[PDB]
Amino acid sequence: MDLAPQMLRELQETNAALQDVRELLRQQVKEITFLKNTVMECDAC
Amino acid sequence: MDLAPQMLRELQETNAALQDVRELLRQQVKEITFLKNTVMECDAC
Amino acid sequence: MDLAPQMLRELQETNAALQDVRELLRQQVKEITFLKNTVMECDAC
Amino acid sequence: MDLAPQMLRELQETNAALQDVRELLRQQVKEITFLKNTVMECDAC
Amino acid sequence: MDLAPQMLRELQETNAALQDVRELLRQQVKEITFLKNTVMECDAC
């Protein structure tokens, strides 16, 4: 029973998931950077 | 011993793990986003 | 020589590393959710 | 060979995606360490 | 046989990148835990 078809589908699913992770990660970096900047300008510090 | 069956199984396992990593990141990004807003509206700042 | 066994080995190691990432992430989210709860009750804000 | 070409293409794309994820995390750690030291060096605290 | 050589190369590249990610997350969780302990002790809160 040839399993290559199914294996290809798993690999494509991997890239689909990874692309989601990358997009979530780059937005997360923006949120952390905003957080950093807000703290710096925090007079209390 | 055609290892396609075992290979396929590892791939399927990789995706299951990645699905979980993605869901975890989504909730994490949400928590961080909430934190950003809070600090921005911080009186002491 | 046949490179299939080597390939399966790389896949097994990929999943091992992926499983570690999941545990770390799982823990990270908790530390963050904790940080959030603390900031929510910061008397400075 | 059959689907081999497409499989190899998915693997390369996964790699490129990983490269970016890695680059983003290295920046994210830098931002977290800064934020860390900033709060650690906050008069208010 | 087959594009096994090129495919294996991409997987080794994948695992090497992944191992770096685990280590980056390793350090990152530590930093977060440190920030958490720091905010928990902030006298401003």
Ligand SMILES: CCCCCCCCCCCCCCCC(=O)O
């Ligand atoms: C029908 C017998 C032919 C000999 C066996 C051919 C071996 C390849 C079977 C397809 C495996 C999945 C796609 C190739 C990718 C890989 O080498 O891992």
Ligand SMILES: CCCCCCCCCCCCCCCC(=O)O
């Ligand atoms: C052959 C398939 C390989 C699968 C590739 C594994 C991808 C793992 C990606 C891990 C991303 C880590 C998430 C970042 C966490 C954080 O933001 O703190």
